[PDB]
What we know:
2 domains; Gag polyprotein (chain E); viral protein; capsid protein; pentameric; HIV-1 CA
Amino acid sequence: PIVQNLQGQMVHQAISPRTLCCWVKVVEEKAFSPEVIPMFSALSEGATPQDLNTMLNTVGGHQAAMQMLKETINEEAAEWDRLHPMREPRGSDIAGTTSTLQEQIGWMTHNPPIPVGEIYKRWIILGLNKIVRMYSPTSILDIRQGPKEPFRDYVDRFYKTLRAEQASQEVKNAATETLLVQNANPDCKTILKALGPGATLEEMMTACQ
Amino acid sequence: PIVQNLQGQMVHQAISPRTLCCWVKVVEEKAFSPEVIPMFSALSEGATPQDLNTMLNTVGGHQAAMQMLKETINEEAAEWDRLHPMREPRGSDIAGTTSTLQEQIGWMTHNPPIPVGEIYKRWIILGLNKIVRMYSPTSILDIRQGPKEPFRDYVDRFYKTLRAEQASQEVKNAATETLLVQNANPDCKTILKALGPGATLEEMMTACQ
Amino acid sequence: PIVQNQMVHQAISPRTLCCWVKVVEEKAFSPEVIPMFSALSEGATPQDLNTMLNTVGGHQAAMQMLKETINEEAAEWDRLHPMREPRGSDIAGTTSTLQEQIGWMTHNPPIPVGEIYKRWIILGLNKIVRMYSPTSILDIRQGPKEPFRDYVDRFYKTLRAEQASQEVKNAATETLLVQNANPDCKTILKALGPGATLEEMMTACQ
Amino acid sequence: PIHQAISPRTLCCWVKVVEEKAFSPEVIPMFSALSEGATPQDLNTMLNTVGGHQAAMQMLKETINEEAAEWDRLHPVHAGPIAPGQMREPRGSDIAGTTSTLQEQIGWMTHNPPIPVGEIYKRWIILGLNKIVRMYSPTSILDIRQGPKEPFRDYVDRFYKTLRAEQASQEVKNAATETLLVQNANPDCKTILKALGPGATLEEMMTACQ
Amino acid sequence: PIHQAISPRTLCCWVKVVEEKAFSPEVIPMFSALSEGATPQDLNTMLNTVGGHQAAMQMLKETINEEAAEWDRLHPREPRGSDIAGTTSTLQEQIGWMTHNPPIPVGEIYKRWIILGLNKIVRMYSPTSILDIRQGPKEPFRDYVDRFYKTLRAEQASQEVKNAATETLLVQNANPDCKTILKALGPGATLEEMMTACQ
């Protein structure tokens, strides 16, 4: 990654072991649960395209997803080239495949900077979103409380599904206002209507325990 | 966070990987056992609202709780606006949604400081308390020693339950004095009466091993 | 904690806290928890020590006893010693501020509230380790089918839990160890004759 | 590394990773990332702390021996004296850190211009790891066929894992994707996949067969 | 170590490793890497924080006792045996000896005693002779080779003995199918070639 020295100038640590080992552990354990994405962001502050590739190349298993992620990176690089045909970085320079660590550093610490790091990062995040959406056990079409299901379990699947579907804040708000109550089992749904409007999720969960 | 360096000066570091991995591991394993709270405090010394949001967004599962926490944060932000209508921070500036890292640092290091990190922290702790109280719902009254249960295991449940209800030190003392002996199984209860009043927990546990 | 760069104050580090939490959960209150507590708590303020205590999960019976021991030692401190002077509860960090705690610890001459709180906590930890391992060294006898190594592990674990002085440990080895072995091993061990090292003894019985 | 001594966090992660993952192909970039700036002595500590897989640690040792011998053949001592500020030339075994001192290793690596013994040893080690990764995963890409009841994702995971274990060139990987992937799908999936027509992304194909 | 006090990251990793691996041979180079620059006090902190294995910690203590006595006999302030094992000396004395010029490296000396004791324990905890290691009839050749070399490592076999065991026993003690395949390969076969032939 790139960091400024005490003197204020832009230099460069190599990716630290603590970072890598945390990243590796997290991807293993969580598979592609939606929280993997903000984790990836937080672990990759200031990363060069070379650090980003080390992160992708050290994930074990999930080769189907790593392969899709590679396709999405290819589609975004091609797209970058169409819109923007030392030297100027091509799409592949940004994904760090046809560029050197030295070139990458040049661009990132230039003034004004070309943050190839940040650009590659958005392509990776775009690929992760797709993979999180594919991997979710759950879907939009199926979100109703089971007849015997605790209200808390159902609320967990409801929000877990929203987060994975990458619902827009409007859609999330709509689903909270409507569905949550609408798709509850009849016992709970009845209790919930009695609370009347303006019921907090806290009040609703307390009412149905 | 904004922590003091070895030289005693106040600095902005980005949230460290070691902090994040510990935090994520802890929340996973412990769910919302009461000790999550002092752990969250200790992990979030000097946090900016942006570091706090990273912590919240990297939690996996428990979306019902994350969603309640988000409601609590919304109620406190609105409340802050009612009492307080560079620039002054609004509710959403304190929750880090409408504000920049540079504004957040500005406010926190200003003299006199406006401690947005600390303020946001208290809202989050409020929401964690409600969640801890919901997730461990069994009343101290229903905690009774099983007929074959070792006295230590029962004492463990008793104090774990008390902690989860955030009992005031008075209430805790009252529950020890009353409920602990009272709800022991008959064998132990009998042994414990023989010891008489003013028995330390140590004496009591020794008597029933 | 307070470390030298001059004496400065760091907040308790995450690496420290996660290790500490891990160790206490895995090990329960095996005797090695105590030197581990000491090594994790170098330079700790009473506020750091309370974070260490409050983050333990489970073992609430034990944490509750430990709290009682702390209460007894604080009261005792008040009886012998009635900026400001620290009361018992100031040392346990409940009625004192981080800034006061630092004040006391770096004053000249220093009032080492950290170190003082630390010994109260260690005292409580010793009691808990002894309770969680209550079997007397005298009742440690090799099972009829128990490998000699396992029995020797329980024997010295037990001695350590009683915090036996090195003299006492040597005396127990010399006396009690062969004595309480199962008859097969006990027989082999008598044949070895006196002056046998623990290594020789364990080799003979594997 | 360059001089700090190898850090505990590094060593613990390294040991954890090699235990858990065995010799899955990702072990190699992991070894690289963990060994930035490493001296030959740091590299030996990494290899000596691996537990288990002694068959593999033994092969790795042989590979290291062959590469050292090979180095000697292409750089025998240049004859004659060593000027001051200068030092001797490293032989094969100096690079593998068996006949050299920490002090010498640092000498060579920080000299100007540098002799990067760390990097050279590292390439031998990586050569050895590649061989072991390929042995621990010997099934050909050609024998990877979707089970009759196997989810399409699982099969795709084996397919690309296998390709990675053979260190296939990007051309070969592309060729195998284009040819072999649909071809070796079970009949249900294979049928669905033909219907999709050409230019189907791996995403589209996995969606279609779930 | 040299003066920092022993770091938590160091201690936690050490404790974790000893717990999980018991006294597998690799514990030794791990102990060495974790204890670079250690004072006798840091070394005692490492020994005192091991949980379990009290038979072994007790034998280790006896070996330290024998080596301290032996030190005294050969070198009768100057550090006595117990000063080196950090029992009768202070942190500040230990720092004195170690940074003196010329140095008396009490850290390093104590370290060798501890390693001497660890080797004895590793040898006792992995007692099976190389001779008793034979490929099972259905055992994959790689698993057998793993046991073979793990066993040799545990016995601290001299490089001569290791070579002899490779030359003889490895092929010799293979199951009959593999042993046959291995004879066909002829001499000068690399371990790689041998493992490939028997997979």
